[PDB]
Amino acid sequence: GSSGSSGMNKLYIGNLSPAVTADDLRQLFGDRKLPLAGQVLLKSGYAFVDYPDQNWAIRAIETLSGKVELHGKIMEVDYSVSKKLRSSGPSSG
């Protein structure tokens, strides 16, 4: 039915001006000597990026998030996590 074994992950980017384009995102990451060895996604208000390794993401975020400004607005990068789901019922054991 509906199942999946955790695996590849991505990073969520917030505070992205409505003028920001995929070209700028790729140019920004590459300009900081941080190439994307995966896929890039640009959403209206945010964007997602695939990181090669955990170390790369942590280093990239620290070098980007809080250290990079786009369109006069500071870009925020963090692990794209949700873990949000309503639960209807107790648990045993």
- Written in H, E and C, the secondary structure of the chain is CCCCCCCCCCEEEECCCCCCCHHHHHHHHHHCCCCCCCCEEEECCEEEECCCCHHHHHHHHHHHCCCCEECCEECEEEECCCCCCCCCCCCCC
Structural class in CATH, domain 1-93: alpha beta
Q: Do 63 and 55 meet the contact criterion of CB atoms below 8 Å apart?
A: no
Domain ranges within the chain, ordered by starting residue: 1-93
Q: Which residues contact 51 (CB under 8 A, 6 or more apart)?
A: 9, 10, 11, 38, 57, 60
Identify residue 93 by its one-letter amino acid code: G
